[PDB]
Amino acid sequence: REAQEAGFALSTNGERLELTGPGPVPAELSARLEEVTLGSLAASAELEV
Amino acid sequence: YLVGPPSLGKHEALLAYLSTQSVETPPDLLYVPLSERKVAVLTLPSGQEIHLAEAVEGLLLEVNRLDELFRQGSFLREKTQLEARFKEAREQQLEALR
Amino acid sequence: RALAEEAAVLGGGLLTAESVEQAIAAREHRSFLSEEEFLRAVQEGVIR
Amino acid sequence: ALRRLRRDWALHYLNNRFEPLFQRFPQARAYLEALRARLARYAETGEPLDPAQWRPNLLTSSSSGTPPPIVYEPYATAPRLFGRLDYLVDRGVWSTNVSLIRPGAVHRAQGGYLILDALSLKREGTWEAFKRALRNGQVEPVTEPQAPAGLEVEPFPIQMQVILVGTPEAFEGLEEDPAFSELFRIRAEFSPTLPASPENCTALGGWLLAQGFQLTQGGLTRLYDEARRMAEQRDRMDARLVEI
Amino acid sequence: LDPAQWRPNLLTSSSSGTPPPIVYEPYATAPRLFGRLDYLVDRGVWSTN
């Protein structure tokens, strides 16, 4: 939803997430992307536990 | 230090007397590595050692997430930005030389 | 400080004059066994 | 610079991952910071991490405390007091880690009482190491000179009460050291003989009944008289209740 | 080239300057006073660095 509101397309690759668009994405958008990915992998670690 | 002639049952009373004593639940002490060379005895509130062990196993398994966080969009884009700046300086030098 | 700790224990948490006197008397008494036996022997006439 | 980022980002999210643990385990700041540093080093250099070298080595569990942990160690040797180090032999290399440290008598007496025999302390030559552990908190697990590398065990505040038990001559060779006086200050001196009185006769009868003996008044009286006989005094009875 | 042979070894880092490093060493054996050499055994070879 944030990527759609920002005018960018999300390109999922399995469990890996990245944002594709013309030029660099906004800094807050990149930070939110990194936080979402890190939360997903932390949830995966908790799933393993 | 209990002093007395032998066969006075000093040990037998002492244990009987100390059994009647009441102390606050002793903390769980455990050897924890502050490094691969240096280990310290740490005291935790009773019953918190099992949770600590579970969390430590979680952080040991966190090597997988450490490896995976180098394969995310933000890390890749920051890497590409760093490479782009380095090749920008490289290309400035290359164009001057050319 | 060790005698003060003993007085505090024997007075609960306060080192009054009675508490310190009790601590000193107990310190003397805990090693009084040989003297007590000697006095008992003197009284019973073993050591005249 | 790539290596620098591959520790910067790792530490940046490891702080967030460790904050809940820092909150839940306030005492373990040192160990958790060590784990964070080791994981940052893993992310930086890609240096393999051995799980066995980073484990909370439990020594004793307790939800009790009534009664307190009372550790009586009649055989007071260094391995039985301060613990012992196990080693794994890999390619002839003797290695050790936290998972190979076993508690001694000192370790399982924490928060309680450690009962030792002064004669044992003299005989095994562990009095020096034991008094060093009491005053300085230096409890060192027993190592062996065949291991190329050991473990640097940190000092530890001693939370136990040490209660020595022994015969007076077993303390004659131990009270010579001023450190014995400074450390052990309360003398629970035992009188070899009790006063000979009806109160002590009744106490002896009750003690024998608690031992499970079936007594008669004549039998208890005869045991009391024989206790006085063993004391070799008319007005004193023998306090050696094991003999009685 | 052996990288472990050519890396400066951190001994101790300054805490705050005040108070100064006050090292009380009650047990004064040579290993605890002058330090220790730890050896790595490779093929029965005790190598240090």
SSE topology sketch:
This is part of a larger assembly, with 5 copies of chain A.
Chain A: H1 2-6, E1 9-13, E2 16-20, H2 27-48
Antiparallel strand pairs in A: 1-2
Brief summary:
Chain D: GO terms for molecular function: ATP binding; ATP-dependent peptidase activity; serine-type endopeptidase activity. The structure is cut from a larger assembly and holds five copies of chain A. Helix content of chain A is 55%, strand content 20%.
Explained architecture:
This is part of a larger assembly, with 5 copies of chain A. Helix content of chain A is 55%, strand content 20%. With 49 residues, chain A is an alpha+beta fold. A two-stranded antiparallel ribbon of chain A has the order 1-2. In chain A, strand 1 and strand 2 (16-20) form a beta hairpin. The longest helix of chain A has 22 residues, at 27-48. Chain A is elongated, with a radius of gyration of 12 Å. Chain A starts with a helix and ends with a helix. Chains in contact: A-B, B-D, C-D, D-E. Strand 3 (38-44) of chain B pairs parallel with strand 8 (152-153) of chain D.
Note the gap between the termini of chain A. 30 Å
Shape of chain A: elongated
Q: Give me the number of helical elements of chain A.
A: 2
Largest interface, C-beta within 8 A? B-D, 62 and 81 residues
The total beta strand count of chain A reads 2
Structural class, from helix and strand content of chain A?
Answer: alpha+beta
Oligomer: part of a larger assembly
Strand content of chain A: 15-25%
What is the alpha-carbon Rg of chain A in Å?
12 Å
- How would a textbook summarize the main sheet of chain A? 2 strands, antiparallel
Please list the strands of the largest sheet of chain A in the order they lie side by side. Answer: 1-2
Helix content of chain A: 55-70%
